[PDB]
Design a protein around this ligand. Sequence first.
Ligand SMILES: CC[C@@H](C)n1ncn(-c2ccc(N3CCN(c4ccc(OC[C@H]5CO[C@](Cn6cncn6)(c6ccc(Cl)cc6Cl)O5)cc4)CC3)cc2)c1=O
Ligand code: HEM
Ligand SMILES: [Cl-]
Ligand SMILES: [Cl-]
Length: 506
Amino acid sequence: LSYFQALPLAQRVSIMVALPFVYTITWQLLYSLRKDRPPLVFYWIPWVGSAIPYGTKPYEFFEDCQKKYGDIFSFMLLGRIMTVYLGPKGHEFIFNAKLADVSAEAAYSHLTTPVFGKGVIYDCPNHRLMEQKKFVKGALTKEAFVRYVPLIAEEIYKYFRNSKNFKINENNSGIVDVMVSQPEMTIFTASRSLLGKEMRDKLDTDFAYLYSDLDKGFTPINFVFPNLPLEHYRKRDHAQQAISGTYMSLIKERREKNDIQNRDLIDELMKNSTYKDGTKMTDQEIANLLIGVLMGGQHTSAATSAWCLLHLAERPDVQEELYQEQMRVLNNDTKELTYDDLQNMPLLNQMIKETLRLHHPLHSLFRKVMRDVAIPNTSYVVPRDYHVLVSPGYTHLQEEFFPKPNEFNIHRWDGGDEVDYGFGAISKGVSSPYLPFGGGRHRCIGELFAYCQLGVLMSIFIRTMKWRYPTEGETVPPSDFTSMVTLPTAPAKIYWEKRHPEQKYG
Ligand SMILES: CC[C@@H](C)n1ncn(-c2ccc(N3CCN(c4ccc(OC[C@H]5CO[C@](Cn6cncn6)(c6ccc(Cl)cc6Cl)O5)cc4)CC3)cc2)c1=O
Ligand code: HEM
Ligand SMILES: [Cl-]
Ligand SMILES: [Cl-]
């Protein structure tokens, strides 16, 4: 190092920028000597790790890692080490892990707690979240869906009429960007049914911008830096307070009038948000919980109906097959749609089921390791402070589980023990290769709402329109895996025409 100082400046600079790369390469060579750790995927760039391949093609990244290291491998991701366990055995290891070994709230809270607010979901012990899930299910019964279906349909028909994306009472055909239309239709239908009429109407005012601001705070870049003094972090914090304050205001007005019925999720939480220990949720916490429930249905559902429309755009045979089922179940379109009719549209539901296979909206689910965990039938130990990463969406796309996994075939769906974590009996095992809604204690409680919402929506699209791509030979767009959910690359335009030009919608 006395030789170093004699070198020309450009060399001394080269050596000094090279030093971090040599140090991390050296540290990875020393790391591979531990046989009690999963293989660490090799990476060139200090700290960044494998962010680029993982962030842009996670399933292809996983597949190449699998061929080289097996089902269990670690990778460096923006200063954090993620341990992946691919396949059914991984579903079981992670989704069914013990509370003492891994924590979802420790992995997610710095991202969700500023968006939803304090005291609920991931800003509370797990046993409280189990009971919050039980409360919310009180508004997700069959009887609730019976009520929701005509409200969701009414919202969709208003949208067809009023939205500049359609204006369907004046145009017989059009081009629409499903990445514009579907997020909007999703928030209108979920508002009207879960928050009710008062809150749905506020979306016709400038209040709607607050939801947009709240959404902007909900990006994966908040996983790494949950708080910067940035403008859009400020707008997010304002929105959470303005929105939750508005829900509390509505909650209070209802309590004064005793206007507490069986209409929406606000009614349900006002009547049934008392924990087993006799304590109960505050209005601020009810409002924060409402924010989280709506947000959990927003991106997953909008992404999914966008993919349905796109896969059907290139399949007029499937559109026609679904249209035939619609005419059988709804008596040639003389019966108003009801929840029982959706339960009798098997092909419609297989179409949603198949879209969710091809496009799981959440490609990666995470838990933080809370104490060293041995991995059964390996020599690996995953140490405290790593993260484990489970990816059912990877298994959806695997030839071993689904022959010709990239083909959209709704007829592949032609056709154990239970455990109660506190929100109802669910499947005890999670070894299925197909888990669009997760499994174990953190499993989705919105699955039937999603089928209800998506089912009304696709039922009405099929009965009202035919559509295709605007250019011949165009196909399904590629996915963008960098956002909250995997969603199609925008814009994603389809050409539609009314099946009944004379029909007026409202
Ligand atoms: C620098 C290069 C660049 C290309 N790059 N480098 C890295 N990345 C990247 C990394 C990771 C990701 N991922 C990982 C995180 N992921 C994600 C994982 C889980 C998740 O949510 C799980 C929890 C929290 O939110 C919900 C979602 N939900 C559940 N049911 C329906 N939605 C949730 C649960 C309950 C409630 Cl009430 C609300 C919500 Cl939102 O569950 C959201 C996003 C998004 C993509 C994206 C990009 C990049 O883009
Ligand atoms: C097609 C639509 C949807 C899909 C694919 C989906 C998927 C998922 C998945 C994979 C999880 C587990 C997350 C994990 O294990 O880390 C989950 C959890 C959850 N989702 Fe959904 N979801 C959808 C719609 C909805 C809707 C409509 C709601 C509410 C109305 C909702 C609310 C929730 C809640 C409350 C949880 C519990 C989180 C926990 O217990 O930690 N989701 N969802
Ligand atoms: Cl009109
Ligand atoms: Cl459930």
